Amino acid sequence: SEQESVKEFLAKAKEDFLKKWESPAQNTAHLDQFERIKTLGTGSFGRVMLVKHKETGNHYAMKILDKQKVVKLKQIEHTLNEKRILQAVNFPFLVKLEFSFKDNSNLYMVMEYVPGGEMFSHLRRIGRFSEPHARFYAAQIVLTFEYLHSLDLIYRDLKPENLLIDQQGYIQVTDFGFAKRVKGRTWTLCGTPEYLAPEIILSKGYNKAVDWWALGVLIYEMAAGYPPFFADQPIQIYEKIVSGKVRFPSHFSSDLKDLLRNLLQVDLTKRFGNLKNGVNDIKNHKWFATTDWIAIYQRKVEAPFIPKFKGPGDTSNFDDYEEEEIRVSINEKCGKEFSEF
Ligand SMILES: C[C@@H](NC(=O)CCCCCNC(=O)[C@H]1O[C@@H](n2cnc3c(N)ncnc32)[C@H](O)[C@@H]1O)C(=O)NCCCCCC(=O)N[C@H](CCCNC(=N)N)C(=O)N[C@H](CCCNC(=N)N)C(N)=O
């Protein structure tokens, strides 16, 4: 009964997703319609900027990708996935893509600006979250993965850096740069070293269970203040990941440790989230016994904290990055590669 209504919700959610999946939205827009305010994040082929839309005064977070760098780093399909998926999803804990466009040089995804900053910065600052606090965030990720996986979407980059804290103290998942729609198995080596499942490292065909592994890492990191597998060199991190060995801080409850042993299960076929009972093994776990799943979805649970809000356009919750020019070439770069964008 509790389950039939979940089933109902999911079927409806799929209907909606497919309508947008099958005919993606397209805009319409130019870089010169925006004032750049601050770089919020950078990477090897793009960056994220706080911008103000001049005509309306609206603030947005604009992901800007350099087409030539995308192509050179063979990320074409991934950027296409990211735009197509983000425009089609609709869920309380997923960042909203407002619109997308492209010009001669760049691809643009204009998201709702979440001024609260990354969970990563808040976690690092406080040191660690209490189990009730970690559980509040974890429950939102569980619901979000239940949503995503029913749509055959694998997220593939869970980490506190990608979890924005909104003005209600709830999560907004951002960065769909590695998300993929795929039934069954996929093979790409992608993600973040500390968060990689063993089967990604071992170069196997892997599935949605990698997202549940990643949830184990996240819960561990939220509650300990550091990830379960760390070392100086990536190779050293990978050896630890595939070993089947993980130590817990002495303050972890026995219920938490039991959940983590089942999420950080190196054998994907025994990993929670990936057994016959699917997500319900997780949702029914003793560690989540006090979680009101529907109250979480409805945002009715008092959040552990609400980020300091200094008005529209405040960036105090983000780190400073070196501000670099955004170039727009006279000539169109990589036209055919990005025609579906
Ligand atoms: C795939 C390719 N993509 C690209 O080049 C395209 C552009 C992507 C920008 C991503 N950032 C972002 O997207 C950030 O922008 C904000 N943001 C995004 N959307 C937003 C929105 N709607 N509203 C507001 N802000 C938003 C958020 O701050 C978000 O984190 C790329 O290279 N993507 C970047 C991923 C590789 C970085 C290596 C690393 O671990 N770097 C960090 C140092 C940089 C610190 N960055 C952040 N804190 N965000 C690092 O080494 N950190 C380690 C720990 C890493 C392990 N993580 C753990 N949790 N343990 C460290 N020790 O500090």
CSV table of C-alpha atoms and ligand atoms in Angstrom, one decimal:
chain,number,residue,atom,x,y,z
A,1,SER,CA,0.0,0.0,0.0
A,2,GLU,CA,2.8,2.3,1.0
A,3,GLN,CA,4.6,0.6,-1.9
A,4,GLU,CA,1.7,0.9,-4.5
A,5,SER,CA,1.7,4.7,-4.1
A,6,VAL,CA,5.5,4.8,-4.7
A,7,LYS,CA,4.9,2.7,-7.8
A,8,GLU,CA,2.2,5.1,-8.9
A,9,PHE,CA,4.4,8.1,-8.3
A,10,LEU,CA,7.2,6.6,-10.3
A,11,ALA,CA,5.2,5.6,-13.3
A,12,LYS,CA,3.8,9.2,-13.5
A,13,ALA,CA,7.3,10.6,-13.0
A,14,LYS,CA,8.5,8.5,-16.0
A,15,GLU,CA,5.7,9.7,-18.2
A,16,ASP,CA,6.8,13.3,-17.6
A,17,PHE,CA,10.5,12.6,-18.0
A,18,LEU,CA,10.0,10.9,-21.4
A,19,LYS,CA,7.9,13.8,-22.8
A,20,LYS,CA,11.0,16.0,-22.2
A,21,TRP,CA,13.5,13.3,-23.0
A,22,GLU,CA,12.0,12.7,-26.4
A,23,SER,CA,11.8,16.4,-27.4
A,24,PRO,CA,14.5,18.4,-25.5
A,25,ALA,CA,13.9,22.1,-24.9
A,26,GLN,CA,16.1,24.5,-26.8
A,27,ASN,CA,16.8,28.2,-26.4
A,28,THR,CA,17.8,31.1,-27.5
A,29,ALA,CA,20.1,33.5,-25.6
A,30,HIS,CA,23.5,35.1,-25.8
A,31,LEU,CA,26.4,35.6,-23.4
A,32,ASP,CA,26.1,39.4,-23.8
A,33,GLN,CA,22.7,39.3,-22.1
A,34,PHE,CA,24.4,38.4,-18.8
A,35,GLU,CA,26.7,40.2,-16.4
A,36,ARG,CA,29.3,37.9,-14.9
A,37,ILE,CA,29.6,38.3,-11.1
A,38,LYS,CA,31.8,35.5,-9.8
A,39,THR,CA,33.4,32.2,-10.7
A,40,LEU,CA,31.8,29.6,-8.4
A,41,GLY,CA,33.7,26.5,-9.6
A,42,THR,CA,36.1,25.4,-12.3
A,43,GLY,CA,37.2,22.2,-14.0
A,44,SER,CA,39.4,21.0,-16.9
A,45,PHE,CA,36.9,22.0,-19.7
A,46,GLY,CA,34.4,24.5,-18.1
A,47,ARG,CA,33.4,26.5,-15.2
A,48,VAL,CA,30.4,27.7,-13.2
A,49,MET,CA,29.6,31.3,-12.9
A,50,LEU,CA,27.3,33.4,-10.9
A,51,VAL,CA,25.7,35.7,-13.5
A,52,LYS,CA,23.0,38.4,-13.5
A,53,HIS,CA,20.5,38.3,-16.4
A,54,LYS,CA,20.5,42.0,-17.4
A,55,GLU,CA,16.9,42.4,-18.7
A,56,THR,CA,15.3,40.8,-15.6
A,57,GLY,CA,18.0,41.2,-12.9
A,58,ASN,CA,17.6,37.5,-12.1
A,59,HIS,CA,20.7,35.7,-10.7
A,60,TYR,CA,21.7,32.3,-12.2
A,61,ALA,CA,24.5,29.8,-11.9
A,62,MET,CA,25.7,29.4,-15.5
A,63,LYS,CA,27.8,26.4,-16.4
A,64,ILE,CA,30.0,27.4,-19.3
A,65,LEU,CA,31.8,24.6,-21.3
A,66,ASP,CA,34.5,25.3,-23.9
A,67,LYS,CA,33.5,23.2,-26.9
A,68,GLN,CA,37.1,22.6,-28.1
A,69,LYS,CA,38.2,21.4,-24.7
A,70,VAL,CA,35.1,19.1,-24.5
A,71,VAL,CA,36.1,17.5,-27.9
A,72,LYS,CA,39.8,17.3,-27.1
A,73,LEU,CA,39.0,15.6,-23.7
A,74,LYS,CA,36.4,13.3,-25.5
A,75,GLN,CA,33.5,14.6,-23.4
A,76,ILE,CA,31.1,15.2,-26.2
A,77,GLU,CA,28.6,12.5,-25.3
A,78,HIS,CA,28.8,13.4,-21.6
A,79,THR,CA,28.0,17.1,-22.2
A,80,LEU,CA,25.1,16.0,-24.4
A,81,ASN,CA,23.8,13.5,-21.7
A,82,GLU,CA,24.1,16.2,-19.0
A,83,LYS,CA,22.0,18.8,-20.9
A,84,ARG,CA,19.4,16.2,-22.1
A,85,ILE,CA,19.0,14.6,-18.6
A,86,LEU,CA,18.9,17.9,-16.6
A,87,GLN,CA,16.3,19.4,-18.8
A,88,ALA,CA,14.0,16.4,-18.5
A,89,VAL,CA,14.1,15.6,-14.7
A,90,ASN,CA,11.9,17.1,-12.0
A,91,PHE,CA,12.5,16.3,-8.4
A,92,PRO,CA,12.7,18.3,-5.1
A,93,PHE,CA,16.4,17.6,-4.5
A,94,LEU,CA,17.7,18.2,-8.1
A,95,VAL,CA,19.0,21.5,-9.2
A,96,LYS,CA,16.7,23.1,-11.8
A,97,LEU,CA,18.1,23.8,-15.3
A,98,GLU,CA,16.3,27.0,-16.5
A,99,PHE,CA,17.6,27.0,-20.1
A,100,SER,CA,20.5,26.1,-22.3
A,101,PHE,CA,22.2,27.6,-25.3
A,102,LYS,CA,25.4,27.7,-27.2
A,103,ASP,CA,27.5,30.1,-29.2
A,104,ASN,CA,30.6,29.9,-31.5
A,105,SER,CA,32.9,28.9,-28.5
A,106,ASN,CA,30.9,27.6,-25.6
A,107,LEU,CA,27.9,25.6,-24.4
A,108,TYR,CA,25.8,27.1,-21.6
A,109,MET,CA,23.6,25.6,-19.0
A,110,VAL,CA,21.8,28.2,-16.9
A,111,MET,CA,20.7,26.8,-13.5
A,112,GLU,CA,18.9,28.1,-10.5
A,113,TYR,CA,21.6,29.7,-8.3
A,114,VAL,CA,21.8,28.0,-4.9
A,115,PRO,CA,23.6,30.5,-2.7
A,116,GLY,CA,24.1,28.2,0.4
A,117,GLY,CA,27.3,26.6,-1.1
A,118,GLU,CA,28.5,23.0,-1.2
A,119,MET,CA,27.9,20.6,1.6
A,120,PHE,CA,31.6,20.0,1.2
A,121,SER,CA,32.6,23.4,2.6
A,122,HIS,CA,30.1,23.2,5.5
A,123,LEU,CA,31.2,19.6,6.4
A,124,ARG,CA,34.9,20.6,6.2
A,125,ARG,CA,34.2,23.7,8.4
A,126,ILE,CA,32.2,21.9,11.1
A,127,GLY,CA,34.4,18.8,11.0
A,128,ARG,CA,31.7,16.1,11.0
A,129,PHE,CA,27.9,15.9,11.1
A,130,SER,CA,26.0,14.1,13.8
A,131,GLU,CA,24.2,10.9,12.7
A,132,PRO,CA,20.8,12.5,12.8
A,133,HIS,CA,22.2,15.3,10.6
A,134,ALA,CA,24.0,12.9,8.2
A,135,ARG,CA,20.8,10.8,8.1
A,136,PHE,CA,18.7,13.8,7.1
A,137,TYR,CA,21.0,14.4,4.1
A,138,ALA,CA,21.4,10.7,3.3
A,139,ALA,CA,17.6,10.2,3.1
A,140,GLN,CA,17.3,12.9,0.4
A,141,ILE,CA,20.0,11.1,-1.7
A,142,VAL,CA,18.2,7.8,-1.3
A,143,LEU,CA,14.9,9.2,-2.6
A,144,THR,CA,16.8,11.0,-5.4
A,145,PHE,CA,18.5,7.8,-6.5
A,146,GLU,CA,15.2,5.9,-6.3
A,147,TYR,CA,13.8,8.7,-8.7
A,148,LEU,CA,16.8,8.6,-11.0
A,149,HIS,CA,17.3,4.9,-11.3
A,150,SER,CA,13.6,4.2,-12.1
A,151,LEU,CA,14.2,6.5,-15.2
A,152,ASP,CA,17.3,4.3,-16.1
A,153,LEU,CA,19.6,7.1,-15.1
A,154,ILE,CA,23.0,6.5,-13.4
A,155,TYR,CA,24.3,9.6,-11.7
A,156,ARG,CA,28.0,8.6,-11.2
A,157,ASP,CA,29.4,11.6,-9.4
A,158,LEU,CA,27.9,11.6,-5.9
A,159,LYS,CA,30.1,13.7,-3.5
A,160,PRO,CA,29.5,16.5,-1.0
A,161,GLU,CA,31.0,19.0,-3.6
A,162,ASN,CA,27.9,18.3,-5.8
A,163,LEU,CA,25.3,18.7,-3.0
A,164,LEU,CA,24.2,22.3,-2.7
A,165,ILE,CA,22.4,23.5,0.4
A,166,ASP,CA,19.3,25.5,-0.4
A,167,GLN,CA,17.6,28.2,1.8
A,168,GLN,CA,15.4,25.6,3.5
A,169,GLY,CA,18.6,23.6,4.5
A,170,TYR,CA,17.8,20.8,1.9
A,171,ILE,CA,20.0,19.4,-0.8
A,172,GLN,CA,20.1,20.4,-4.5
A,173,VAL,CA,22.2,17.9,-6.5
A,174,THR,CA,24.2,19.6,-9.2
A,175,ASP,CA,26.7,18.6,-11.9
A,176,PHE,CA,25.2,15.9,-14.2
A,177,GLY,CA,28.4,15.9,-16.2
A,178,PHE,CA,28.7,12.1,-15.8
A,179,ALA,CA,25.0,11.1,-15.7
A,180,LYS,CA,23.9,8.6,-18.3
A,181,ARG,CA,20.6,7.0,-19.4
A,182,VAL,CA,21.3,3.4,-19.8
A,183,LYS,CA,19.4,0.1,-19.1
A,184,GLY,CA,21.8,-2.5,-17.9
A,185,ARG,CA,25.5,-1.9,-18.1
A,186,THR,CA,28.0,0.8,-19.0
A,187,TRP,CA,31.8,1.0,-19.1
A,188,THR,CA,33.2,4.6,-19.0
A,189,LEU,CA,35.9,5.3,-16.5
A,190,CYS,CA,34.6,8.4,-14.8
A,191,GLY,CA,33.8,9.9,-11.4
A,192,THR,CA,35.9,11.0,-8.5
A,193,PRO,CA,38.7,8.7,-7.1
A,194,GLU,CA,37.6,8.6,-3.5
A,195,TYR,CA,34.0,7.7,-4.6
A,196,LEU,CA,34.7,5.0,-7.3
A,197,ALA,CA,33.1,1.6,-6.8
A,198,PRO,CA,35.5,-1.4,-7.2
A,199,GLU,CA,33.9,-2.5,-10.4
A,200,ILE,CA,34.6,0.9,-12.1
A,201,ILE,CA,38.3,0.6,-11.0
A,202,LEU,CA,38.5,-3.1,-12.1
A,203,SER,CA,37.2,-1.8,-15.5
A,204,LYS,CA,34.1,-4.0,-15.5
A,205,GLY,CA,30.7,-3.5,-17.0
A,206,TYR,CA,28.9,-1.7,-14.2
A,207,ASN,CA,25.4,-0.6,-13.4
A,208,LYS,CA,23.4,1.5,-11.0
A,209,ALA,CA,24.9,-0.3,-7.9
A,210,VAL,CA,27.9,2.1,-8.3
A,211,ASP,CA,25.6,5.0,-7.1
A,212,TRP,CA,24.7,2.9,-3.9
A,213,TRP,CA,28.4,2.3,-3.3
A,214,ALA,CA,28.9,6.1,-3.6
A,215,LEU,CA,26.1,6.6,-1.1
A,216,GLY,CA,28.1,4.5,1.4
A,217,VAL,CA,31.1,6.7,0.9
A,218,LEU,CA,29.1,9.9,1.3
A,219,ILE,CA,27.4,8.7,4.5
A,220,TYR,CA,30.8,7.6,5.9
A,221,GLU,CA,32.3,11.0,4.9
A,222,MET,CA,29.4,13.0,6.4
A,223,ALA,CA,29.6,11.1,9.7
A,224,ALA,CA,33.4,10.8,10.0
A,225,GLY,CA,34.5,14.0,8.4
A,226,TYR,CA,36.8,12.2,6.0
A,227,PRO,CA,36.2,9.5,3.3
A,228,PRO,CA,36.7,5.7,4.1
A,229,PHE,CA,39.4,5.3,1.4
A,230,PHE,CA,42.1,7.9,1.2
A,231,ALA,CA,45.8,8.0,0.4
A,232,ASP,CA,48.3,10.3,-1.3
A,233,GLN,CA,48.2,8.6,-4.7
A,234,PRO,CA,45.1,7.6,-6.6
A,235,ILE,CA,46.5,4.1,-7.1
A,236,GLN,CA,46.8,3.8,-3.4
A,237,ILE,CA,43.1,4.8,-3.0
A,238,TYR,CA,42.1,2.2,-5.6
A,239,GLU,CA,44.0,-0.6,-3.7
A,240,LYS,CA,42.1,0.3,-0.6
A,241,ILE,CA,38.7,0.4,-2.4
A,242,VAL,CA,39.0,-3.1,-3.9
A,243,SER,CA,40.5,-4.7,-0.8
A,244,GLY,CA,37.2,-5.3,1.0
A,245,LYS,CA,38.7,-3.6,4.1
A,246,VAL,CA,37.2,-0.5,5.8
A,247,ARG,CA,37.7,0.8,9.3
A,248,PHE,CA,35.1,2.9,11.2
A,249,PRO,CA,35.6,5.7,13.7
A,250,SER,CA,34.8,4.6,17.2
A,251,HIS,CA,31.8,7.0,17.5
A,252,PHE,CA,29.9,5.3,14.6
A,253,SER,CA,26.8,3.6,15.9
A,254,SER,CA,26.4,-0.2,15.3
A,255,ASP,CA,23.4,0.5,13.0
A,256,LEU,CA,25.5,2.9,10.9
A,257,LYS,CA,28.4,0.4,10.6
A,258,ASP,CA,26.0,-2.4,9.5
A,259,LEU,CA,24.4,-0.1,6.8
A,260,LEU,CA,27.9,0.9,5.6
A,261,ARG,CA,29.1,-2.7,5.4
A,262,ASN,CA,26.2,-3.4,3.1
A,263,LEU,CA,26.7,-0.2,0.9
A,264,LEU,CA,30.4,-0.5,0.8
A,265,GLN,CA,30.1,-4.2,-0.2
A,266,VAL,CA,32.8,-4.8,-2.8
A,267,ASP,CA,30.8,-7.6,-4.4
A,268,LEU,CA,28.2,-5.6,-6.4
A,269,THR,CA,25.8,-8.6,-6.4
A,270,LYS,CA,25.6,-8.4,-2.5
A,271,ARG,CA,25.4,-4.6,-2.3
A,272,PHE,CA,22.3,-3.0,-0.7
A,273,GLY,CA,20.3,-1.2,-3.4
A,274,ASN,CA,21.2,-3.9,-5.9
A,275,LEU,CA,19.4,-7.0,-4.3
A,276,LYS,CA,16.0,-8.4,-5.1
A,277,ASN,CA,14.3,-5.8,-2.8
A,278,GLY,CA,16.1,-2.9,-4.4
A,279,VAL,CA,16.0,0.5,-2.6
A,280,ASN,CA,13.8,-0.9,0.1
A,281,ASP,CA,16.7,-2.8,1.8
A,282,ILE,CA,18.1,0.7,2.4
A,283,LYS,CA,14.9,2.4,3.3
A,284,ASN,CA,14.0,-0.4,5.8
A,285,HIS,CA,17.4,-0.5,7.4
A,286,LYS,CA,17.4,0.1,11.2
A,287,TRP,CA,19.7,3.2,10.7
A,288,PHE,CA,16.7,4.8,8.9
A,289,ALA,CA,14.1,3.6,11.3
A,290,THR,CA,13.3,7.1,12.5
A,291,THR,CA,13.2,8.6,8.9
A,292,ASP,CA,9.7,9.7,7.7
A,293,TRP,CA,10.3,9.2,4.0
A,294,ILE,CA,7.2,11.2,2.8
A,295,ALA,CA,7.9,14.2,5.2
A,296,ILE,CA,11.5,14.3,3.8
A,297,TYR,CA,10.1,14.3,0.2
A,298,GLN,CA,7.7,17.1,1.2
A,299,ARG,CA,10.4,19.1,3.0
A,300,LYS,CA,8.5,19.1,6.2
A,301,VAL,CA,11.4,18.0,8.4
A,302,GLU,CA,13.3,20.7,10.3
A,303,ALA,CA,16.7,21.0,8.6
A,304,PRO,CA,19.9,20.7,10.7
A,305,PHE,CA,20.9,24.2,9.6
A,306,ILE,CA,20.0,27.0,7.2
A,307,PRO,CA,22.9,28.7,5.4
A,308,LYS,CA,23.5,32.4,6.1
A,309,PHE,CA,21.7,34.5,3.5
A,310,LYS,CA,23.1,37.9,2.5
A,311,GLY,CA,20.5,38.8,-0.1
A,312,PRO,CA,20.3,38.1,-3.9
A,313,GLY,CA,23.7,37.5,-5.4
A,314,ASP,CA,25.7,36.9,-2.2
A,315,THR,CA,28.6,34.5,-2.7
A,316,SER,CA,30.0,34.4,0.8
A,317,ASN,CA,29.4,30.6,1.0
A,318,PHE,CA,31.7,29.9,-2.0
A,319,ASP,CA,35.5,29.8,-2.3
A,320,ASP,CA,37.3,32.4,-4.4
A,321,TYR,CA,38.6,31.3,-7.8
A,322,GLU,CA,40.9,33.1,-10.3
A,323,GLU,CA,38.7,35.1,-12.6
A,324,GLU,CA,39.4,34.3,-16.3
A,325,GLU,CA,38.2,35.9,-19.5
A,326,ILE,CA,35.4,34.2,-21.4
A,327,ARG,CA,36.2,34.3,-25.0
A,328,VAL,CA,33.6,34.0,-27.8
A,329,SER,CA,35.3,33.3,-31.2
A,330,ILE,CA,34.4,35.0,-34.5
A,331,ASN,CA,34.0,31.6,-36.0
A,332,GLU,CA,31.9,28.7,-35.0
A,333,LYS,CA,33.8,25.9,-33.3
A,334,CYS,CA,32.8,22.2,-33.4
A,335,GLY,CA,29.4,22.8,-35.1
A,336,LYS,CA,28.5,19.2,-36.1
A,337,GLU,CA,29.7,17.7,-32.8
A,338,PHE,CA,27.2,19.8,-30.8
A,339,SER,CA,24.2,20.2,-33.2
A,340,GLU,CA,22.0,18.1,-30.8
A,341,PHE,CA,22.9,20.6,-28.0
B,1,LIG,C1,34.6,16.8,-15.4
B,1,LIG,C2,35.1,18.2,-15.5
B,1,LIG,N1,34.1,19.2,-15.7
B,1,LIG,C3,34.4,20.4,-16.1
B,1,LIG,O1,35.5,20.9,-16.3
B,1,LIG,C4,33.1,21.3,-16.3
B,1,LIG,C5,33.0,22.3,-15.1
B,1,LIG,C6,32.7,21.6,-13.8
B,1,LIG,C7,32.8,22.5,-12.6
B,1,LIG,C8,32.5,21.5,-11.4
B,1,LIG,N2,32.2,22.4,-10.2
B,1,LIG,C9,30.9,22.8,-9.9
B,1,LIG,O2,29.9,22.5,-10.6
B,1,LIG,C10,30.8,23.6,-8.7
B,1,LIG,O3,30.1,24.9,-9.0
B,1,LIG,C11,29.1,25.2,-8.0
B,1,LIG,N3,27.7,25.1,-8.6
B,1,LIG,C12,27.3,24.2,-9.5
B,1,LIG,N4,26.0,24.5,-9.7
B,1,LIG,C13,25.6,25.5,-9.0
B,1,LIG,C14,24.4,26.1,-8.8
B,1,LIG,N5,23.3,25.7,-9.5
B,1,LIG,N6,24.3,27.1,-7.9
B,1,LIG,C15,25.4,27.4,-7.2
B,1,LIG,N7,26.5,26.8,-7.3
B,1,LIG,C16,26.7,25.9,-8.2
B,1,LIG,C17,29.4,24.2,-6.9
B,1,LIG,O4,30.3,24.8,-6.0
B,1,LIG,C18,29.9,23.0,-7.6
B,1,LIG,O5,30.8,22.2,-6.8
B,1,LIG,C19,36.0,18.5,-14.3
B,1,LIG,O6,37.2,18.6,-14.4
B,1,LIG,N8,35.4,18.7,-13.2
B,1,LIG,C20,36.0,19.0,-11.9
B,1,LIG,C21,36.3,17.7,-11.1
B,1,LIG,C22,37.8,17.4,-11.0
B,1,LIG,C23,38.3,18.2,-9.8
B,1,LIG,C24,39.4,17.4,-9.0
B,1,LIG,C25,39.2,17.6,-7.5
B,1,LIG,O7,38.9,16.7,-6.7
B,1,LIG,N9,39.4,18.9,-7.1
B,1,LIG,C26,39.3,19.4,-5.7
B,1,LIG,C27,39.9,20.8,-5.6
B,1,LIG,C28,38.9,21.8,-6.1
B,1,LIG,C29,37.8,22.1,-5.0
B,1,LIG,N10,36.5,22.2,-5.7
B,1,LIG,C30,35.4,22.2,-4.9
B,1,LIG,N11,35.4,22.1,-3.6
B,1,LIG,N12,34.2,22.3,-5.6
B,1,LIG,C31,40.0,18.4,-4.7
B,1,LIG,O8,41.1,17.9,-5.1
B,1,LIG,N13,39.4,18.2,-3.5
B,1,LIG,C32,40.0,17.3,-2.5
B,1,LIG,C33,38.9,16.3,-2.1
B,1,LIG,C34,38.3,15.5,-3.3
B,1,LIG,C35,37.6,14.3,-2.7
B,1,LIG,N14,36.2,14.7,-2.2
B,1,LIG,C36,35.8,14.3,-1.0
B,1,LIG,N15,34.6,14.6,-0.6
B,1,LIG,N16,36.6,13.5,-0.2
B,1,LIG,C37,40.4,18.1,-1.2
B,1,LIG,N17,41.1,17.4,-0.4
B,1,LIG,O9,40.0,19.2,-1.0
